[PDB]
Design an enzyme around this catalytic site. Structure first.
Site, PDB file in Angstrom:
ATOM      1  N   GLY A 102       1.165  -1.531   0.365  1.00  0.00           N
ATOM      2  CA  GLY A 102      -0.130  -0.213  -0.099  1.00  0.00           C
ATOM      3  C   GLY A 102       0.665   1.618   0.050  1.00  0.00           C
ATOM      4  N   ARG A 118       6.825   1.554   3.038  1.00  0.00           N
ATOM      5  CA  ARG A 118       6.768  -0.279   3.305  1.00  0.00           C
ATOM      6  C   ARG A 118       7.087  -0.996   2.075  1.00  0.00           C
ATOM      7  NH1 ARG A 118       2.198  -2.020   5.983  1.00  0.00           N
ATOM      8  NH2 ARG A 118       2.012  -0.677   8.321  1.00  0.00           N
ATOM      9  N   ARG A 137       4.825  10.016  -9.051  1.00  0.00           N
ATOM     10  CA  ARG A 137       3.056  10.245  -8.120  1.00  0.00           C
ATOM     11  C   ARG A 137       3.246   9.623  -6.599  1.00  0.00           C
ATOM     12  NH1 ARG A 137      -0.969  12.009 -12.552  1.00  0.00           N
ATOM     13  NH2 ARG A 137       0.894  11.376 -13.959  1.00  0.00           N
ATOM     14  N   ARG A 173      -0.485  -9.694  -1.904  1.00  0.00           N
ATOM     15  CA  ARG A 173      -1.103  -8.070  -1.568  1.00  0.00           C
ATOM     16  C   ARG A 173      -0.837  -8.446   0.694  1.00  0.00           C
ATOM     17  NH1 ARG A 173      -3.850  -3.565  -0.123  1.00  0.00           N
ATOM     18  NH2 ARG A 173      -2.116  -2.631   0.688  1.00  0.00           N
ATOM     19  N   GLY A 199      -0.295  -6.163   3.878  1.00  0.00           N
ATOM     20  CA  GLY A 199      -1.587  -4.828   4.402  1.00  0.00           C
ATOM     21  C   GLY A 199      -1.313  -5.049   5.556  1.00  0.00           C
ATOM     22  N   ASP A 216      -4.067  -3.684  12.571  1.00  0.00           N
ATOM     23  CA  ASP A 216      -4.164  -2.160  13.050  1.00  0.00           C
ATOM     24  C   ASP A 216      -4.727  -2.492  14.104  1.00  0.00           C
ATOM     25  OD1 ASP A 216      -1.908  -1.186  11.578  1.00  0.00           O
ATOM     26  OD2 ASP A 216      -3.166  -0.413  10.106  1.00  0.00           O
TER      27      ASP A 216
END
EC number: 2.4.2.1
Lengths: 219, 223
Positions: free
Chosen positions: B21, B25, B43, B86, B88, B197
């Site tokens: 993400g 990281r 960007r 993925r 994250g 989280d």
């Protein structure tokens, strides 16, 4: 001390259960096992205790009713449930009448799963059930496809899903998976191709072999 | 002969790709590798060639808050990616069991995401490749790291989350359902690994190790 739609004891319910469509297909499986015991027969719901490769597990039908069957089994002790049956190819050029498909997930085009949880929730099977089915099929050098089933309660959109790479279509696997996931019961399916909008024995062997292999971990 | 939103060559795109993400990281993963080569930065889209356990595979970012993940996954699937994973963060939906700090490897997701619904009817499962899931579990056990397995709610944010939690969804995050479906549509194998989280530290390095380890293991079968 008995169950409603199955007519068998909670004592008689095994960790691993194999679920099929036609009650005659249950008669064709019990014979193939090492030994067996008949438990009951009720309108459309045949239940037999199967002994195979050292292990003991139920084989049960419900008609060509499934929701209540899966419900009943998950409530009363089933830890693993596998559906073996027929389906339609949605990849005619690749997947042909006679081919076997082990399915890890399904498209929820089924009344019952939507009554239980929002459609966004995935119909997905247990990994170790999927692994176990694949290893039996390869152990017996039987080629098998792996993919997603469209579980649709009539059979269109089937074109959409086919070009979204769904492999096959059948009636109830999405129902089992979700009930499974809700009830903490591990599920899977293995399917043989019928139409397209000897091999059967190998499939049954994979199914039976996989069940035995899973039954090990609860005995 | 190079690509639009990623700014790297189709030649440079590896069979196995690791997607994260925050671009910071990616800097935290570089360090953990054996070696690496930076490819581009655009960007919000950092892309690095990662060398680990003898294998070579891309790592790429695209932003926080589900920025332009869709186009990232699209771009990768169009131009050669065979496996995409993925890594994250996420929120526990089982507070008593799954606690802040725990790692979760996910096999499937709840489609509460704008983009997947634009691509196929909501009934279609967001589901990962099983061999990718197997590979992640075996790395985590090989490194004696305890990990949860379960379903993610991929959500773009009232309390359906209660429903899903009592339907045994394990965690919640933003974009995993999107990857899985794009994957399944484009015939690309996908999977996901997530660190908790908060509901309603050291551990991050283990996760990265699992991710990196799994990628290496998968990369073998294409090189």
């Amino acid at each position: 001390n008995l169950l409603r739609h199955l007519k068998i004891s909670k004592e008689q319910i095994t960790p691993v259960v194999l679920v099929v469509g036609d009650p005659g297909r249950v008669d064709k499986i019990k014979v193939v096992c090492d030994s067996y015991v008949d438990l009951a027969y009720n309108r459309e719901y045949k239940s037999v205790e199967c002994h195979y490769k050292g292990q003991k597990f139920l084989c049960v039908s419900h008609g060509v009713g499934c929701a209540v069957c899966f419900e009943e089994l998950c409530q009363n002790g089933a830890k693993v449930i596998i559906r073996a049956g027929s389906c339609g190819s949605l990849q005619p050029d690749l997947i042909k009448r006679g081919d076997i498909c082990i399915c890890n997930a399904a498209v929820r085009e089924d009344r019952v799963s939507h009554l239980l949880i929002h459609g966004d929730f995935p119909a997905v099977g247990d990994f170790d059930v999927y692994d176990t089915l694949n290893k039996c099929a390869q152990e017996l050098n039987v080629p098998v496809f792996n993919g997603i089933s469209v579980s649709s309660d009539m059979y269109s959109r089937l074109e959409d899903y086919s070009k979204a790479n769904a492999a096959v279509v059948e009636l109830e696997l999405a129902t089992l998976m979700v009930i499974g996931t809700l009830r903490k019961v591990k599920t899977g399916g293995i399917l043989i191709v019928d139409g397209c909008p000897h091999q059967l024995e190998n499939m049954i062997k994979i199914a039976l072999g996989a069940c035995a292999k899973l039954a090990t971990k609860y005995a």
